[PDB]
Design a binder for these strands. Sequence first.
RNA 1: AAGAACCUUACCAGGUCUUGACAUCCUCUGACAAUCCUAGAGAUAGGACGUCCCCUUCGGGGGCAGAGUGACAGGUGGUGCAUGGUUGUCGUCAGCUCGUGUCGUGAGAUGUUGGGUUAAGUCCCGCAACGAGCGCAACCCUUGAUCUUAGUUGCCAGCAUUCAGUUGGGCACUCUAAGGUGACUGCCGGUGACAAACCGGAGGAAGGUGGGGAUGACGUCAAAUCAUCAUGCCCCUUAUGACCUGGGCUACACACGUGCUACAAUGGACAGAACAAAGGGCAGCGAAACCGCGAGGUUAAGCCAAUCCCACAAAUCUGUUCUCAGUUCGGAUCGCAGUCUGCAACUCGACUGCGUGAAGCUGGAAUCGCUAGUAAUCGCGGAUCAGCAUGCCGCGGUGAAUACGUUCC
Lengths: 102, 210, 84, 60, 130, 153
Amino acid sequence: MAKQKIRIRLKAYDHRILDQSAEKIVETAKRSGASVSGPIPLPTEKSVYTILRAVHKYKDSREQFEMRTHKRLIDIVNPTPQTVDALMRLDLPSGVDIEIKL
Amino acid sequence: GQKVNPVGLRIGVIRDWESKWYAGKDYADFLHEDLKIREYISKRLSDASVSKVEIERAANRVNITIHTAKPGMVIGKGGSEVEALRKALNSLTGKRVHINILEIKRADLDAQLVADNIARQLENRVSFRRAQKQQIQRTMRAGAQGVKTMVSGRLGGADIARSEYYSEGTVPLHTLRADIDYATSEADTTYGKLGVKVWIYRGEVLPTKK
Amino acid sequence: SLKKGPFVDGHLMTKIEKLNETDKKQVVKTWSRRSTIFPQFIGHTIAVYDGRKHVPVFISEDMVGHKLGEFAPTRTYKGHASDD
Amino acid sequence: AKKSMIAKQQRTPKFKVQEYTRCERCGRPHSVIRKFKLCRICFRELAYKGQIPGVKKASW
Amino acid sequence: MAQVQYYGTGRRKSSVARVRLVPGEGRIVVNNREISEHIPSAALIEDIKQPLTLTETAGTYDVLVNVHGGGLSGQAGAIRHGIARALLEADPEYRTTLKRAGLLTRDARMKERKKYGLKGARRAPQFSKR
Amino acid sequence: KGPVAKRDVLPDPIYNSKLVSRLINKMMIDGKKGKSQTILYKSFDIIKERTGNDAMEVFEQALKNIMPVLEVKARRVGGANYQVPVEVRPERRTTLGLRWLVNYARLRGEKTMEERLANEILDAANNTGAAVKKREDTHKMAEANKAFAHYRW
RNA sequence: AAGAACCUUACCAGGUCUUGACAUCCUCUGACAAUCCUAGAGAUAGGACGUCCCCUUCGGGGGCAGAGUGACAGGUGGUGCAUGGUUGUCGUCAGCUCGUGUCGUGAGAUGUUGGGUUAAGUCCCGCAACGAGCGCAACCCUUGAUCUUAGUUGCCAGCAUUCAGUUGGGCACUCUAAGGUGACUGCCGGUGACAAACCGGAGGAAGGUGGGGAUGACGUCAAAUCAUCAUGCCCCUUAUGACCUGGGCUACACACGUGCUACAAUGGACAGAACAAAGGGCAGCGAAACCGCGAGGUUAAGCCAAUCCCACAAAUCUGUUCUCAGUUCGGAUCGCAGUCUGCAACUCGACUGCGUGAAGCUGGAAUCGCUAGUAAUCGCGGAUCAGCAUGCCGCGGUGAAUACGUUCC
């Protein structure tokens, strides 16, 4: 009964942009479609960075700026071509890492 | 410190980054092109002026929207100027471009503009004290819960060095919802450069839910 | 070093080759001290460029795998105050 | 001599090993992270300027 | 789908455990291994088994537990808090004696993140005047 | 300020009592509960082997025998130091007892650490050894010079 | 200094250039650019093979080179006793001030003192003062409890399957990240003016600013950085500039600061067994198979990664063995033979095999850290990075002793 299915994945630094993008990318899945799996959470990987405060010495004082990387997955049992043609247009967001695979 | 920049704290919790995008195979190259766009907008800062440019990119696309106190300076007559700028940027970025424009209401309220203006006043060799007073009066005309301002380096050419600051109303940088605008500027008198700083407390932001 | 093999810059190779086949010229300066001594190179005397001054160096049969520039120390001794 | 140094770097090295990392915004070599090719101070000032998401600062 | 059993998650310092109090002989099972075997010897294992003995004594219920993360003592402590909370879910009435026992809460504590300029997230290597 | 709360130790299963757990705390080095565990059980075993008696009894008599009744406390009010004798807190009593116990046990020089802990604890049982001698020395520094610490301070 | 073999590098020595290595204006031709040979250490010069492109009725447009030319360009040159900018320090200490008014000839004072209370100028009450601003606090992040939404690459309990959560299935649970719940002295009791607050107890996953981080107030030290950048002034310019080879930044009689490894039987050595977290990876991580004692190599699957790889956790536990000594303690120093990276490992790289087996058997005077998951200690990862991490930044394992107290520093 198992069969290959399209499984779009999203990635972004900001999360509000990411789950707004998730809602926008599943909303097209809902119309002219069926089932529509929700956006399941992924572990997310941050990158820490310690940098010196002073231009010269005083290495004892520093600061940690870091960049987290969120990830998400979305699925749909029915390929439904009409919402795939609808999928081609995406006004938002400029900052998103959608990836399509079947 | 002794004074950490509020702009380095406000971002994230209460304000958006000046340039948002995603990366990507080349995180550096997007940053290079964007910093170059800053380098040319800085050339546009010479007279047309700008408070800030917001930037967005999505693979072979860019959204370098501008907001400025004087919108017609960059548009020109017939809109030819924004087009020529669009070509000058298209020649460099190597990708499609469509620069946007915005006209801020009560533009004096913005920290970048008042800081650039008082800096130009320092270029005009007007007394720095009276200039800061006119700053506080003008921002008072702008209407705000609290405002602070500061200048450093040579002042009137007197003494080896001096630093001054004036303020009125609450200016709570330690507040995490303060939404305080921050600005810096660099005057260039023959006696020497003049450091410029200004803090603008727009007021607390109340979180929403639906 | 490692394998295949010791590495002269290669100009010294043709130089010592021509000097071996004929002429038998003696005493020649070199800036490239990195080159290792070779069996074909034997018996030659090279002025070694330490930097400050060239130091002439005869080549005994015993020396091959040692670097040609190793024999001349750039370092100046010692220098110390009250000896003994 | 930073102009001579960036001129030295932008030109192709005689050997590929020679290419040390350096930021474009400033000509200072040394202590430049390779992953972002920015100055520690370059990245510092841009960090107060805010160039990338997000939080910032000193979490976890 | 078999006979009814209670279960209680129990973690400590990044070491999580999933106990299952199935009634039976009372022999304990950790990762398909005996507690006498999985952590020899180790006497502390009896301290992992103490809360059941401190409460009336004794059933004794069989335990099928699956634990992951942490070291041996940490995962064993996870077995302890895990059988403790499961015993809490056994009957509501027992909880009163449990207040005297403490033996719950799992006090969250774990090694502190290192401070910059410090080796032990508190310790400073050295100081010297002049 | 004020007094601080102190945690009670998890009781040792063998022999039940928490005080033995206090020994598990003190004898331990490099943060190893297991090494203290092995030396503890081997200690009970070697006590079981020579001169038969309950380990808890000889241990109890030993710890009762190694607690000082008084302790001096140096204070420089003027020229040269001046120790002040005072009655010891029972927690401080067992603390000094166990610390001088493990310390002198460490220096016994025997090839087996457990056997010399045994010889030491039996020396405490027999009113002898370096530990009892040291408590006696503290007893000498005390009493003989308690007059400055009579009821003054 | 988040990587000095060359480069970096600035400094030295030698060899070379003067509108220049780098930017612009002019006139001005011409595409620019490369393919090799010759001489040289390179730097570059001497030759040929070569470029001679794109839009225009001929003026041109375009990068770009070359030529000359005045301009200029250039300095990690001097000045942090000219600075902007950025950062230490007292100090995450609770103070520093202003508006109005009052008092004082005046400077100044009152407010900010006093009583109680607090980590706090914290709150409360009173007070010739009433307010307010910058801080503390709160607001944020992280950690812990729980719910809801959402179940793959992650998850395996209930079911069958298998060498294997691996494969059917399950999407409970662990786990994952969004929105919520929760702590506020609030509930009780006592003290206190019935105020603030403290103490005790209950409730509770966490109790009395829960733990940690971020958050550093007016200012002090003419504190640090002209050498990140920017630059006032001063100085140099066929040279304080530029190119290159080699050096040096690693010196060596010694002093000091700061780490690492040990001086050993709670141990060393061997064998077996067992528990992590977090991070990194496509110019990359590189499994498995095979070759070599080892380091690595040959070859190559998979992985843009909750899939796969870096990758095995180490202490520990279980036994065997040595039986108290410069030792089966420790590893220094050096020799020989290999290996990774790189045009290239002499100066001045790392690692391995073999051999050699310093000193040190716990350290004077003196001095440092730390109140609990802290000290103690064991391994792992990353930034750095061709190669080079005992340093730095993190991750987790194991995990205490003591705090009577403000006499003294």
